[PDB]
Design a protein around this ligand. Structure first.
Ligand SMILES: CCCCCCCC/C=C/CCCCCCCC(=O)O[C@@H](COC(=O)CCCCCCCCCCCCCCC)COP(=O)([O-])OCC[N+](C)(C)C
Ligand SMILES: CCCCCCCC/C=C/CCCCCCCC(=O)O[C@@H](COC(=O)CCCCCCCCCCCCCCC)COP(=O)([O-])OCC[N+](C)(C)C
Ligand SMILES: CCCCCCCC/C=C/CCCCCCCC(=O)O[C@@H](COC(=O)CCCCCCCCCCCCCCC)COP(=O)([O-])OCC[N+](C)(C)C
Ligand SMILES: CCCCCCCC/C=C\CCCCCCCC(=O)O[C@@H](COC(=O)CCCCCCCCCCCCCCC)COP(=O)([O-])OCC[N+](C)(C)C
Ligand SMILES: CCCCCCCC/C=C\CCCCCCCC(=O)O[C@@H](COC(=O)CCCCCCCCCCCCCCC)COP(=O)([O-])OCC[N+](C)(C)C
Ligand SMILES: CCCCCCCC/C=C\CCCCCCCC(=O)O[C@@H](COC(=O)CCCCCCCCCCCCCCC)COP(=O)([O-])OCC[N+](C)(C)C
Ligand SMILES: CCCCCCCC/C=C\CCCCCCCC(=O)O[C@@H](COC(=O)CCCCCCCCCCCCCCC)COP(=O)([O-])OCC[N+](C)(C)C
Ligand SMILES: [Cl-]
Ligand SMILES: [Cl-]
Ligand SMILES: [Cl-]
Ligand SMILES: [Cl-]
Ligand SMILES: [K+]
Ligand SMILES: [K+]
Lengths: 472, 472
């Protein structure tokens, strides 16, 4: 049995911190402003805080022993909400595996292209490296699960040293790191980056790429049978990990916006103060014109800055090669946590014969009854999406399915509080049914703003799976 | 008590034939093709045929005496579906009143501008004439309802003479009617108009303006307490009126497309055969170039043809002034049928205290207990939408709310057949629950394609009104 720190807090902080922390935060401050990106982080934190209060209200409804994620939901609420939440959550983690390993493969491909190693084109090397790293992540999940419970504190002390490396490298003004952007903390760059640019995107198109960085909060409730006291561990670690990771996202956004310019040519300039005809806040001798795009229907033909290079946190970092290779720790820990959590929920769902034909993905081979057909189905669903070797098209799909699962959780606890269900007495201090209704309406409306036909498909599927289990 | 002809068939044919028959059919053949407009008419006929089978399945579920539209639905199915169908249907007819009288006012304004009568600008004369014609339509509904039961056969023999006037004026080739478009039935014009143009619109933007011409099919079920035998009158007249009006729409579309060109300058040409350098199917001596638009982001600066003038059926007609002033008959009959049917449903809903605060719109003043507060609320909701003095922005709203009401009817009969409701034995020969489910899914998907945020608002409102009445 684990305590609340090592069993809930470290698990949720390792699942939440993933691709977008080191790869795509600076791009989000580049597209939006500092103000709009802080509004984005606060909105995702509001959604996940309401869903964390709803999950805590489920977890404090009696039912200590014999836990899990599907078990608590399907036993506090009915099977109609429980089966649909289980199916949508299993599919969401199975598709999130692809997002994390595509981010890992993109980082490895850019590290190879900084050297001379280049086999095929850039979008085909992500398909090759992403395929090798998901058939190796599959082998760990079915043969090496014992060491993974010890390795997670190792992964967390790699990740926090990466974050501290970035934050203390921001204050060190290096003259060689100019021409890649990155001057010191400056007021001119802070005023220039305070306000949107949206060079090909929109608000709610940048939100759909941020919001996978806020998911992963049900990693503590996914192990309730391995906790000491789940009534006190699940509301503590979840709502603490949400606060810690949200504050690190806000700090990364403000710190990236206040010291890096949006565009930069990677050519140094001999001047130290440019002729007074630009006034574009680079008074340090750098003229970063002829990189802003001409028309308002094209991307910039630059190579560095906040808008362009995707890896500028390795430039800002004091020791970029090894310490800011906590990208590997973050992405592989989140992908491995999502590779073992999607067949687990699906095997727990396929043991109650709720849905007719899926009952063959429940036969756990071996001694611990690990679902091997579930692992191979998750590997197939992940490998279908790795072949879309682009993160910015995978991430709105994950955002859609996680907003659907969180909306279903919030609406199910609202409906159980409203309907006066027989076994529903949630003794949690910060649970209100109208906050859950507000969170469900907010998740559904944002899911429709992001992409309306995928939202309509997901809502029709969830309504069909509810009406099927009602009249059975 | 009425028979099935005079009580159902004439009522449904007068409610269905409305604005779009004489005003906006030729514009729909102008924007789309002949093929796409026939596909549009067949889709609207499929939706209304499935909804007519569902309404017949409700109407054959016992319950002869003491009828109405709200009564049959709320007594065969529950109050949860019945109250929401009643509210959405009351709002749909209350807003459709504005569409019919805005079409009437637009016709009267164009007839005045063909003369010298012009008080204010064109969009402000529709607001003035549309306001006078809805406070005069209100006086008939509360003081002259006795003569209206005799006047409807008069209105129908005006309307069918208008239709025959158009269809026999199509075959009469008049040389003076050229330069307004309108050559004879020609193969070149039929081949030229066979294929879309979409000069500012899209498919499903032209469908949203057509589909109010297919609504009005519940005008026979809205009077079940005044019928002789509603078990045999409501499935007969509804499904016959749908077929008759759909065939007249298909005939009008094909006949308009095969004899009128899309653009035309209203200037006659002395030539009888133009120099062979255009080949634009007007070999009759007319050169209708310099009216096609240059860029693909603007409307044509022409004045006549299928795309432009909105009143070309009065040009094709043999006697345009009096007989093709069946526009007044069609629009005023449909507006008067929707002004007496929205307070009726709403007063029947406000007598069962389902929704809390609306109970004051049920107190019928007078001897027949006509709901006067309901009439004034319908007049207010209509007059709010008449001030948007443009038909092409009113008509997608009516399309949204009627697709919502028809989707609710189809889903309610599917859900009652699936759930095995206690008093649900629909002895109708052509009712199937999967056809009703297909009609409900089709109406919901089309409602989302037309406008997604209005569809999301309507679906959230209907979901809230269902969950309110369930847990009361
Ligand atoms: C403005 C307002 C607009 C409103 C418009 C409405 C909105 C539109 C809403 C539309 C909602 C559609 C609801 C459909 C209802 C399903 C039919 C059903 O209930 O079961 C039927 C089919 O039984 C089966 O064998 C099929 C089992 C799966 C069917 C559902 C999953 C399909 C979607 C998931 C796809 C895969 C997902 C998995 C991968 C992610 C039962 O058959 P039976 O013979 O009748 O059983 C008799 C027993 N009984 C009488 C007691 C019942
Ligand atoms: C955009 C426009 C879309 C238009 C098409 C939309 C597709 C929807 C169209 C659906 C219509 C097609 C299904 C009909 C099949 C019936 C087979 C049959 O005849 O046997 C039996 C059914 O028993 C069955 O086996 C039913 C199997 C179908 C269940 C799945 C329903 C579709 C779920 C949809 C999920 C959402 C779909 C989207 C999700 C991805 C006969 O029925 P019965 O049980 O005997 O009861 C009859 C009793 N009578 C005796 C009352 C008096
Ligand atoms: C992918 C999946 C994503 C899923 C996301 C899903 C998200 C979709 C979101 C869907 C939102 C739907 C949920 C909201 C419904 C709540 C109803 C309610 O709470 O009322 C309750 C109180 O409230 C009141 O008394 C208010 C007064 C009546 C207002 C009617 C409700 C609001 C309707 C607004 C429409 C405006 C219409 C304007 C035109 C008229 C009823 O009070 P009660 O009677 O005491 O009930 C006690 C029950 N008991 C006795 C058993 C204890
Ligand atoms: C769009 C994106 C952003 C969306 C965000 C905004 C979206 C709006 C979302 C949510 C809005 C929040 C509503 C706040 C209501 C608080 C009033 C109150 O305390 O009532 C209470 C006082 O009991 C009474 O004295 C009766 C008062 C009327 C009941 C209020 C119901 C409001 C229905 C609103 C219908 C909304 C339909 C929505 C349709 C659109 C009654 O309940 P209770 O006693 O507290 O029960 C506690 C039981 N428990 C102890 C087990 C927990
Ligand atoms: C009136 C009530 C206000 C509610 C405010 C609540 C907070 C709202 C906050 C903020 C409001 C939204 C501001 C930004 C608008 C979205 C811009 C955008 O991204 O385009 C969008 C739509 O394109 C449109 O047409 C947008 C038109 C406005 C719709 C949004 C308001 C309706 C809110 C809901 C009304 C229901 C209310 C439910 C009950 C409460 C996206 O277009 P797409 O084609 O789908 O994307 C394709 C994606 N792809 C590229 C990957 C393929
Ligand atoms: C199977 C049941 C499963 C249920 C779920 C299925 C998922 C849904 C299935 C299908 C949805 C497919 C739509 C994707 C559109 C691409 C993105 C886009 O452009 O959005 C636009 C599409 O609005 C348009 O009209 C654009 C022009 C046509 C584009 C294709 C329409 C559908 C094609 C044929 C499909 C035939 C479907 C079958 C019907 C015969 C949105 O813009 P808007 O909404 O128009 O804004 C209006 C605002 N205004 C009023 C202020 C102007
Ligand atoms: C885009 C819109 C945004 C929101 C999307 C919604 C997301 C949907 C996801 C989750 C929401 C779940 C929906 C229902 C909520 C439960 C409340 C309820 O209905 O209680 C009822 C149960 O319900 C039933 O028994 C059958 C469900 C019928 C719902 C029909 C809604 C029609 C509105 C169409 C508009 C929606 C169109 C959606 C778009 C196509 C009554 O409770 P009971 O007495 O306990 O019943 C016992 C019966 N039993 C013994 C057999 C078990
Ligand atoms: Cl992430
Ligand atoms: Cl999660
Ligand atoms: Cl009409
Ligand atoms: Cl109707
Ligand atoms: K994450
Ligand atoms: K009509």
């Amino acid at each position: 049995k684990f305590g609340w720190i090592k069993g809930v807090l470290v698990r949720c902080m390792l699942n939440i911190w993933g691709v977008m922390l080191f790869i795509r935060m600076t791009w989000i401050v580049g597209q939006a402003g500092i103000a709009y990106s802080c509004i984005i982080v606060i909105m995702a934190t509001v959604v996940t805080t309401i869903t964390g209060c709803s999950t805590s209200a489920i977890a404090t409804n009696g039912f200590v022993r014999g836990g899990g994620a599907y078990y608590l939901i399907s036993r506090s609420l009915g099977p109609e909400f429980g089966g649909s939440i289980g199916l949508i959550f299993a599919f969401a983690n199975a598709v999130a595996v692809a997002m994390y390993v595509v981010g890992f493969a993109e980082t490895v491909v850019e590290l190879l292209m900084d050297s001379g190693l280049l086999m095929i084109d850039q979008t085909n090397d992500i398909r090759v490296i992403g395929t090798i790293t998901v058939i190796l992540l599959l082998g760990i999940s079915v043969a090496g699960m014992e060491w993974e419970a010890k390795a997670q504190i190792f992964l967390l002390v790699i990740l926090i040293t990466a974050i501290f490396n970035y934050f203390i490298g921001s204050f060190i003004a290096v003259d060689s790191k100019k021409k890649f952007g990155f001057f010191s903390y400056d007021a001119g760059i802070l005023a220039e980056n305070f306000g949107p640019d949206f060079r090909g995107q929109t608000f709610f198109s940048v939100f759909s790429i941020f919001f996978p960085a806020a998911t992963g909060i049900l990693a503590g409730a996914n192990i309730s049978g391995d906790l000491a006291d789940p009534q006190m561990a699940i509301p503590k670690g979840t709502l603490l990990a949400i606060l810690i990771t949200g504050l690190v996202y806000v700090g990364v956004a403000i710190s990236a916006g206040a010291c890096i310019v949006r565009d930069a040519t990677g050519i140094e300039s001999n001047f130290t103060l440019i002729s007074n005809c630009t006034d574009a806040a680079c008074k340090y001798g750098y003229d970063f014109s002829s990189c802003r795009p001409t028309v308002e229907g094209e991307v910039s033909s630059c190579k560095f800055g906040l808008h362009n290079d995707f890896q500028v946190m390795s430039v800002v970092s004091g020791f970029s090669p090894l310490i800011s290779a906590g990208i590997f720790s973050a992405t592989l820990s989140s992908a491995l946590a999502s590779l073992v959590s999607a067949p687990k929920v699906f095997q727990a769902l396929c043991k109650d014969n709720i849905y007719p034909g899926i009952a063959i993905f429940g036969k756990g081979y071996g001694k611990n009854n690990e679902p091997l057909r579930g692992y191979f189905l998750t590997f197939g669903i992940a490998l279908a999406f790795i072949l879309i070797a682009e993160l910015n098209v995978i991430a709105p799909i994950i955002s859609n399915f996680f907003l659907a699962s969180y909306a279903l959780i919030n609406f199910s606890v609202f409906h159980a509080s409203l309907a006066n269900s027989p076994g529903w007495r949630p003794s949690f201090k910060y649970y209100n049914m109208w906050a859950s209704l507000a969170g469900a309406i907010l998740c559904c409306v944002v899911m429709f703003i992001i992409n309306w036909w995928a939202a309509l498909l997901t809502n029709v599927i969830v309504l069909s799976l509810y009406i099927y289990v009602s009249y059975k």
